[PDB]
Design an enzyme around this catalytic site. Sequence first.
Site, mmCIF file in Angstrom:
data_model
loop_
_atom_site.group_PDB
_atom_site.id
_atom_site.type_symbol
_atom_site.label_atom_id
_atom_site.label_comp_id
_atom_site.label_asym_id
_atom_site.label_seq_id
_atom_site.Cartn_x
_atom_site.Cartn_y
_atom_site.Cartn_z
ATOM 1 C CD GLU A 127 -6.186 -15.017 -15.133
ATOM 2 O OE1 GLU A 127 -5.390 -15.777 -14.471
ATOM 3 O OE2 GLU A 127 -6.571 -15.639 -16.077
ATOM 4 C CD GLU A 178 -3.907 0.080 -8.921
ATOM 5 O OE1 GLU A 178 -3.195 0.407 -8.040
ATOM 6 O OE2 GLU A 178 -4.067 -1.096 -9.555
ATOM 7 N NE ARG A 211 -1.583 3.557 -7.170
ATOM 8 C CZ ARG A 211 -2.745 3.418 -6.466
ATOM 9 N NH1 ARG A 211 -3.455 2.085 -6.941
ATOM 10 N NH2 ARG A 211 -2.757 3.898 -5.406
ATOM 11 N N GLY A 238 -12.140 -3.054 -4.610
ATOM 12 C CA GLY A 238 -10.904 -3.268 -3.933
ATOM 13 C C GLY A 238 -10.180 -2.010 -3.409
ATOM 14 C CD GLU A 279 -15.648 -11.984 -6.730
ATOM 15 O OE1 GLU A 279 -15.387 -11.432 -5.848
ATOM 16 O OE2 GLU A 279 -14.982 -11.991 -7.853
ATOM 17 C CG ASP A 338 3.301 4.846 -9.189
ATOM 18 O OD1 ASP A 338 3.358 6.009 -9.712
ATOM 19 O OD2 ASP A 338 2.965 3.933 -9.778
ATOM 20 C CD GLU A 361 -9.086 -4.490 -0.072
ATOM 21 O OE1 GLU A 361 -9.080 -3.715 -0.802
ATOM 22 O OE2 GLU A 361 -8.847 -5.762 0.405
ATOM 23 C CG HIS A 406 3.553 0.186 -8.404
ATOM 24 N ND1 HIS A 406 2.478 1.207 -8.864
ATOM 25 C CD2 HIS A 406 3.093 -0.869 -8.253
ATOM 26 C CE1 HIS A 406 1.259 0.408 -8.835
ATOM 27 N NE2 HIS A 406 1.436 -0.688 -8.815
ATOM 28 C CG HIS A 436 -2.123 -1.078 0.861
ATOM 29 N ND1 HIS A 436 -3.213 -1.115 -0.111
ATOM 30 C CD2 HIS A 436 -2.026 -2.361 1.405
ATOM 31 C CE1 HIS A 436 -3.722 -1.932 0.000
ATOM 32 N NE2 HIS A 436 -3.163 -3.061 0.697
#
Length: 319
Positions: A115, A106, A17, A41, A92, A14, A63, A265, A8
Amino acid sequence: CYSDVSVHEEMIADRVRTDAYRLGILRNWAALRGKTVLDVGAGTGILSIFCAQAGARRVYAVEASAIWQQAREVVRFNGLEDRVHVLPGPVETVELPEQVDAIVSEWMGYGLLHESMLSSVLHARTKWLKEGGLLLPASAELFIVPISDQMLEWRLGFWSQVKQHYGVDMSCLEGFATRCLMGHSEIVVQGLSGEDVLARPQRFAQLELSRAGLEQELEAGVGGRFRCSCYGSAPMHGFAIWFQVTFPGEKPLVLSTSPFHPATHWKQALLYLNEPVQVEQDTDVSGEITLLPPRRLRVLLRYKVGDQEEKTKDFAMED
Ligand SMILES: Cc1ccc2c(c1)[C@@H](c1ccc(F)cc1)N(C(=O)c1ccc(Br)o1)CC(=O)N2
Ligand SMILES: Nc1ncnc2c1ncn2[C@@H]1O[C@H](CSCC[C@H](N)C(=O)O)[C@@H](O)[C@H]1O
């Protein structure tokens, strides 16, 4: 939770980003003001807070990992707990009271974790996004280019320099170093610069994230053919792959991980040939590349450098 804080820390440190997400989201203030957002997330919650700063009425910050405790804390600490609701657990199975006007996430990167993150974002889009809802970012593109890795070149050359320092000739271990550093079938994540790039980068795929059946397209595999022409004499070590993503604006904002753009990153993903091949000005380099899912994301590469015969080298990410 050491590697937990480092991850984190790395993301937030970054600036490319983080400013890209901040500006990307803020530039949609007109579409977000008074509307509802799902942050898939949410991590430490910073993107959810960016959405509130852009004017969102309600943000659902979902999260799955223990960092959600810190997200709750950061939101409460900034006095936004009325507007940003941190919800633990996987997207989900989360239950929202309403469908949302926009999704932010992200998800991008190299490996099985990323993925899985795109799949989750696509699941959330289908389940919770209203027709015509906003996706931040909205698309991604993948690029490939032949490269000469300067750092690798040094490492390969190291064994020839030992005699000069210690009076023992170890130049004979170049073969060994080459086999070990180039002869494997793993993707290597490494930051390159513009001078490593041997030709014009070629786009080999586009992912428009609004498309239903993208999940199905991904399972077949993403990629395509490419062709380019080298700029000059160099030891070609392989190919670099990288991505960009685009936030709609009214010019769209592009977050890029190219070696010509500011370092991120994410760095780039390197596909080394089994050994170096010399190229010259106007050497044609062409091939076909496919990314697809013992649980592994395979990179399938068939390529041709100059007058060499076509060669296959396949790589994989087991995580
Ligand atoms: C087939 C598939 C499915 C999901 C998916 C990928 C590939 C790609 C991907 C990454 C960034 C993007 F902007 C787009 C795609 N990912 C990779 O690991 C990858 C890219 C290059 C190499 Br080398 O590996 C994981 C990911 O974030 N998402
Ligand atoms: N299925 C899922 N549902 C909810 N969260 C998930 C998930 N899969 C992964 N995650 C979480 O998504 C996060 C990706 S890291 C990005 C963190 C944050 N959005 C930021 O931009 O700073 C991780 O914290 C991980 O725990």
